[PDB]
Amino acid sequence: SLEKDKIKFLLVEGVHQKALESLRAAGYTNIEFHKGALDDEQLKESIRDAHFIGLRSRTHLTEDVINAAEKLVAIGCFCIGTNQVDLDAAAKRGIPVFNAPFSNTRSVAELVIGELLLLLRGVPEANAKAHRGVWNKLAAGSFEARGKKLGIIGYGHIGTQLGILAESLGMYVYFYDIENKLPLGNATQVQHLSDLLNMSDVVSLHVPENPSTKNMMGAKEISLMKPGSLLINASRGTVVDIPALCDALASKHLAGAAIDVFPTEPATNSDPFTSPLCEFDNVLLTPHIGGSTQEAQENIGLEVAGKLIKYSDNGSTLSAVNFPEVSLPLHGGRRLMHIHENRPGVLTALNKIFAEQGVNIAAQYLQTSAQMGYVVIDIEADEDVAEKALQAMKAIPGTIRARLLY
Amino acid sequence: SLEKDKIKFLLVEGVHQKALESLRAAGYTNIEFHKGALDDEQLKESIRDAHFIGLRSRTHLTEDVINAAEKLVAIGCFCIGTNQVDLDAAAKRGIPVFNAPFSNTRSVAELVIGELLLLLRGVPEANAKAHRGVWNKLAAGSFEARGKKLGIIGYGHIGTQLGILAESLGMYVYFYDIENKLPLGNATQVQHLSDLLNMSDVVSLHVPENPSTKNMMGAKEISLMKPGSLLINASRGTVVDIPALCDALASKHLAGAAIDVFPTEPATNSDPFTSPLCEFDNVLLTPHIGGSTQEAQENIGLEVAGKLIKYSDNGSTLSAVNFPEVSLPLHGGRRLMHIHENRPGVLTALNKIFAEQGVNIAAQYLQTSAQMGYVVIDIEADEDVAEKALQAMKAIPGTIRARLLY
Amino acid sequence: SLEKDKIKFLLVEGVHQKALESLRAAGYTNIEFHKGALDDEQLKESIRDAHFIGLRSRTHLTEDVINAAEKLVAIGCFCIGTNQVDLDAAAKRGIPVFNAPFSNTRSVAELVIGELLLLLRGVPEANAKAHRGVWNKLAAGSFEARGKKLGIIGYGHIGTQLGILAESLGMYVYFYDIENKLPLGNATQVQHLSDLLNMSDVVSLHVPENPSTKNMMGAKEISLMKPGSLLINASRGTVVDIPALCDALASKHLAGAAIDVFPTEPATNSDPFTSPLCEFDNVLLTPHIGGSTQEAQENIGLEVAGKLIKYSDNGSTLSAVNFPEVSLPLHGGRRLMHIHENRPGVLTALNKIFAEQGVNIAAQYLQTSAQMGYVVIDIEADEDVAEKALQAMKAIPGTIRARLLY
Amino acid sequence: SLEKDKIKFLLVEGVHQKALESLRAAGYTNIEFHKGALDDEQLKESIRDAHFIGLRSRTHLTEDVINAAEKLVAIGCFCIGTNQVDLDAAAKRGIPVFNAPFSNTRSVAELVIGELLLLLRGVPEANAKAHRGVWNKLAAGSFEARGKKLGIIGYGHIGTQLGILAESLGMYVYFYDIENKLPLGNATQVQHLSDLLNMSDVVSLHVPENPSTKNMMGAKEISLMKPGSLLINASRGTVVDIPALCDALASKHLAGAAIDVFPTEPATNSDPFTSPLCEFDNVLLTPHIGGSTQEAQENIGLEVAGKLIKYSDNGSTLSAVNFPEVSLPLHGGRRLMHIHENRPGVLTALNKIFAEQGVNIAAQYLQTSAQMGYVVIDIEADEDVAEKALQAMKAIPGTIRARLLY
Ligand SMILES: NC(=O)c1ccc[n+]([C@@H]2O[C@H](COP(=O)([O-])OP(=O)(O)OC[C@H]3O[C@@H](n4cnc5c(N)ncnc54)[C@H](O)[C@@H]3O)[C@@H](O)[C@H]2O)c1
Ligand SMILES: NC(=O)c1ccc[n+]([C@@H]2O[C@H](COP(=O)([O-])OP(=O)(O)OC[C@H]3O[C@@H](n4cnc5c(N)ncnc54)[C@H](O)[C@@H]3O)[C@@H](O)[C@H]2O)c1
Ligand SMILES: NC(=O)c1ccc[n+]([C@@H]2O[C@H](COP(=O)([O-])OP(=O)(O)OC[C@H]3O[C@@H](n4cnc5c(N)ncnc54)[C@H](O)[C@@H]3O)[C@@H](O)[C@H]2O)c1
Ligand SMILES: NC(=O)c1ccc[n+]([C@@H]2O[C@H](COP(=O)([O-])OP(=O)(O)OC[C@H]3O[C@@H](n4cnc5c(N)ncnc54)[C@H](O)[C@@H]3O)[C@@H](O)[C@H]2O)c1
Ligand SMILES: O=C(O)CCC(=O)C(=O)O
Ligand SMILES: O=C(O)CCC(=O)C(=O)O
Ligand SMILES: O=C(O)CCC(=O)C(=O)O
Ligand SMILES: O=C(O)CCC(=O)C(=O)O
Which among B80, C106, C141, B400 has a CA at the least distance from the CA of D121?
A: C106
- Decide if A342 touches D, using CB distance below 8 A: yes
Spatial strand order in the sheet of B9-11? B31-33, B9-11, B52-55, B74-77, B97-98
Supply the DSSP string of A378-397, one letter for each residue: EEE--HHHHHHHHHHHHTST
Q: Is residue C189 located within the same domain as residue C256?
A: yes
Please report the beta strands in D78-233, taking only residues with DSSP state E, as ranges in sequence order: 97-98, 149-153, 172-176, 188-189, 202-205, 229-233
Pairwise CA distance, residues B109 & D366, whole Å: 60
Q: How many domains does chain C have?
A: 3
Residue A221, min C-alpha distance to chain B (Å):
26
Verify whether the Cβ–Cβ distance C365 to B365 is below 8 Å: yes
Which among D389, D372, D256, D284 has a CA at the least distance from the CA of D335?
A: D389
CATH number of residue B348's parent domain: 3.30.70.260
Pairwise CA distance, residues B66 & B85, whole Å: 9
CATH number of residue D68's parent domain: 3.40.50.720
Pairwise CA distance, residues B75 & B147, whole Å: 47
For an interface test with D, the pick among A351, A356, A378 (most D C-beta atoms closer than 10 Å) comes out as: A351
Supply the DSSP string of A228-286, one letter for each residue: TEEEEE-S-TTSB-HHHHHHHHHTTSEEEEEE---SS--SSTTS----GGGG-TTEEE-
Pairwise CA distance, residues B158 & D84, whole Å: 63
What is the torsion angle, in degrees rounded to the nearest 10, for the CA atoms of residue A102, residue A104, residue A106 and residue A107? Answer: -160
Chain B neighbours (≥3 Cβ pairs under 8 A) are A, C
CA C385 to chain centre: 41
Find the distance separating the first CA and the last CA of chain C, reported in whole Å: 13
Q: Is residue C74 located within the same domain as residue C153?
A: no
* Ligand 4 pocket check for D233: Cβ under 6 Å: no
CB-based contact D152:C145 (threshold 8 Å): no
- Decide if B367 touches C, using CB distance below 8 A: yes
- Decide if C368 touches B, using CB distance below 8 A: yes
Find the distance separating the first CA and the last CA of chain D, reported in whole Å: 13
Q: Which residue's CA is minimally distant from atom 4 of ligand 6?
A: B57
3-state secondary structure of D285: strand
Q: Which residue's CA is minimally distant from atom 15 of ligand 3?
A: C157
Which among A255, A246, A226 has a CA at the least distance from the CA of A116?
A: A255
- Tally Cβ neighbours within 10 Å of residue A380: 16
> What's the D103 CA to ligand 8 centre distance in angstroms?
10
Q: What is the largest CA-CA distance in chain D?
A: 87
CA B400 to chain centre: 27
Instruction: Closest CB to C133: pick one of D106, D265, D273.
Output: D273
CB-based contact C84:C61 (threshold 8 Å): yes
Q: What are phi and psi of B77, to 5 degrees?
A: -85, 105
- Decide if B35 touches A, using CB distance below 8 A: no
- Side chain identity at residue D223, one-letter code: S
Pairwise CA distance, residues B369 & B176, whole Å: 33
- Side chain identity at residue A64, one-letter code: D
Pairwise CA distance, residues C223 & C247, whole Å: 10
3-state secondary structure of B15: coil
3-state secondary structure of C339: strand
Pairwise CA distance, residues C111 & C117, whole Å: 10
Helix and strand element counts for chain D (H, E)? 13, 16
CB-based contact C255:C280 (threshold 8 Å): no
- Decide if C344 touches B, using CB distance below 8 A: yes
Determine the length of chain D: 406
Contacts of C136 (CB under 8 A, 6+ apart): C125, C126, C129, C130, D269, D287
HSE toward the beta carbon, residue A239, CA cutoff 13 A: 21
Verify whether the Cβ–Cβ distance C367 to B363 is below 8 Å: yes
The answer to the question of whether B234 is labelled as a binding residue is yes
Please report the beta strands in D177-330, taking only residues with DSSP state E, as ranges in sequence order: 188-189, 202-205, 229-233, 254-259, 283-285
Pairwise CA distance, residues A237 & C190, whole Å: 47
Q: What is the C-alpha R_g of chain C?
A: 26
Contacts of C141 (CB under 8 A, 6+ apart): C122, C228, C255, D294
User: What one-character DSSP code corresponds to residue B5?
Assistant: G
Reading phi first (left if > 0) and then psi (alpha if -120 to 50, else beta), residue C345 is in left
Residue A366, min C-alpha distance to chain D (Å):
5
CA A203, A204, A208: angle at the middle one, nearest 5? Answer: 135
- Decide if B292 touches A, using CB distance below 8 A: yes
* Ligand 4 pocket check for D176: Cβ under 6 Å: yes
Q: Which residue's CA is minimally distant from atom 2 of ligand 4?
A: D290
- Decide if D362 touches A, using CB distance below 8 A: yes
Chain C neighbours (≥3 Cβ pairs under 8 A) are B, D
Pairwise CA distance, residues D178 & B139, whole Å: 38
With 0-12 / 13-18 / 19 or more C-beta atoms within 10 angstroms meaning exposed / middle / buried, residue C181 is middle
Measured CA to CA in angstroms, residue B99 lies from B96, B306, B320, C117 at distances of: 10, 11, 8, 48
Asked about D236 being catalytic, the answer comes back as yes
Which among C359, C357, C314, C309 has a CA at the least distance from the CA of C332?
A: C314
CB-based contact C74:C96 (threshold 8 Å): yes
Pairwise CA distance, residues D252 & D231, whole Å: 12
- C202-226 burial, b at 16+ Cβ within 10 Å, e below that, comes to bbbbbbeeeeebeebbeeebbebbb
CB-based contact B197:B151 (threshold 8 Å): yes
Pairwise CA distance, residues D128 & D124, whole Å: 6
All residues of chain C having their beta carbon less than 8 Å from the beta carbon of residue D268 are 135
Q: Is residue B247 located within the same domain as residue B343?
A: no
Pairwise CA distance, residues D396 & D398, whole Å: 6
- Tally Cβ neighbours within 10 Å of residue C267: 10
The secondary structure element, H or E, covering residue B76 is: strand B74-77
Determine the residue of chain D that is closest to A343 in CA distance.
D360
Of A238, A272, A293, the domain-final residue: A293
Measured CA to CA in angstroms, residue D126 lies from C230, D227, D229, D258 at distances of: 20, 21, 18, 15
All residues of chain A having their beta carbon less than 8 Å from the beta carbon of residue D361 are 347, 366, 368
Pairwise CA distance, residues C305 & C28, whole Å: 11
- C238-257 burial, b at 16+ Cβ within 10 Å, e below that, comes to bbbbbebbbbbbeeebbbbb
Give the technique used to solve this structure.
X-ray
Which among D52, D12, D18, D6 has a CA at the least distance from the CA of D36?
A: D12
> What's the B288 CA to ligand 8 centre distance in angstroms?
63
Q: Which of A21, A265, A279, A387 is catalytic?
A: A265
Kindly give the number of the ligand 6 atom that is closest to the alpha carbon of B81: 9
Q: Is residue B332 located within the same domain as residue B317?
A: no
Q: Is residue C279 located within the same domain as residue C175?
A: yes
Pairwise CA distance, residues C232 & C227, whole Å: 15
Pairwise CA distance, residues A102 & A213, whole Å: 19
Q: Which of D63, D70, D209, D265 is catalytic?
A: D265
Pairing of strands D229-233, D254-259: parallel
The answer to the question of whether B60 is labelled as a binding residue is no
* Ligand 4 pocket check for D151: Cβ under 6 Å: no
3-state secondary structure of C83: coil
Pairwise CA distance, residues D81 & C4, whole Å: 73
3-state secondary structure of C248: helix
Residue A65 is part of which domain span?
A: 1-104+294-322
All residues of chain B having their beta carbon less than 8 Å from the beta carbon of residue C367 are 362-363
Pairwise CA distance, residues B143 & A293, whole Å: 5
Verify whether the Cβ–Cβ distance C121 to D114 is below 8 Å: yes
Q: Is residue B88 located within the same domain as residue B49?
A: yes
Pairwise CA distance, residues A267 & B71, whole Å: 71
CA C344 to chain centre: 36
Pairwise CA distance, residues C377 & C396, whole Å: 16
User: What one-character DSSP code corresponds to residue C183?
Assistant: P
Q: What are phi and psi of C355, to 5 degrees?
A: -65, -60
Pairwise CA distance, residues B97 & B87, whole Å: 7
Reading phi first (left if > 0) and then psi (alpha if -120 to 50, else beta), residue D27 is in left
Determine the length of chain B: 406
Q: Which residue's CA is minimally distant from atom 8 of ligand 6?
A: B79
- Which ligand minimizes its atom distance to the CA of B12? 6
User: What one-character DSSP code corresponds to residue C276?
Assistant: G
Q: Which residue's CA is minimally distant from atom 4 of ligand 8?
A: D79
Measured CA to CA in angstroms, residue A248 lies from A143, B251, B305, D182 at distances of: 20, 41, 38, 48
Contacts of A179 (CB under 8 A, 6+ apart): none
Q: Is residue C257 located within the same domain as residue C359?
A: no
Contacts of B219 (CB under 8 A, 6+ apart): B241, B244, B247, B248
Please report the beta strands in B183-250, taking only residues with DSSP state E, as ranges in sequence order: 188-189, 202-205, 229-233
CB-based contact B357:B388 (threshold 8 Å): yes
> What's the B156 CA to ligand 2 centre distance in angstroms?
6
Helices within C283-362 (DSSP H only): 294-314, 346-357
Instruction: Closest CB to C289: pick one of D121, D268, D289.
Output: D121
CB-based contact D281:D129 (threshold 8 Å): yes
CA D392, D395, D399: angle at the middle one, nearest 5? Answer: 115
Reading phi first (left if > 0) and then psi (alpha if -120 to 50, else beta), residue B38 is in beta
Asked about D131 being catalytic, the answer comes back as no
Kindly give the number of the ligand 5 atom that is closest to the alpha carbon of A78: 1
Pairwise CA distance, residues B324 & D194, whole Å: 63
- Tally Cβ neighbours within 10 Å of residue B370: 11
Instruction: Closest CB to A297: pick one of B114, B139, B288.
Output: B139
- Decide if D146 touches C, using CB distance below 8 A: yes
> What's the A96 CA to ligand 5 centre distance in angstroms?
19
Determine the length of chain C: 406
Q: Residues followed by a break in chain B, C–N over 2.5 Å?
A: none
Determine the residue of chain A that is closest to B270 in CA distance.
A135
> What's the C139 CA to ligand 8 centre distance in angstroms?
8
Chain C contacts in chain D segment 254-283 (CB below 8 A): 265-266, 268-269, 271-275, 278, 281
Contacts of D210 (CB under 8 A, 6+ apart): none
Q: Is residue D146 located within the same domain as residue D221?
A: yes
Pairwise CA distance, residues B340 & B401, whole Å: 7
Q: Is residue C228 located within the same domain as residue C279?
A: yes
Pairing of strands D52-55, B9-11: unpaired
Q: Which residues pair with B151 in a beta bridge?
A: B174, B203
Chain D contacts in chain C segment 154-183 (CB below 8 A): 165, 168-169
Site residues for ligand 7, CB cut-off 6 Å: C 56-57, 79-81, 104, 291-292, 296
Q: Which of A51, A106, A236, A340 is catalytic?
A: A236
CB-based contact B235:B154 (threshold 8 Å): yes
* Ligand 1 pocket check for A209: Cβ under 6 Å: yes
Pairwise CA distance, residues D95 & D97, whole Å: 7
Residue C198, min C-alpha distance to chain B (Å):
34
Pairing of strands A399-404, B9-11: unpaired
CB-based contact C196:C142 (threshold 8 Å): no
Verify whether the Cβ–Cβ distance B122 to A289 is below 8 Å: yes
Q: Is residue C214 located within the same domain as residue C253?
A: yes
Cite the active site residues of C.
236, 265, 288
Q: Is residue B283 located within the same domain as residue B193?
A: yes
Q: Is residue D246 located within the same domain as residue D111?
A: yes
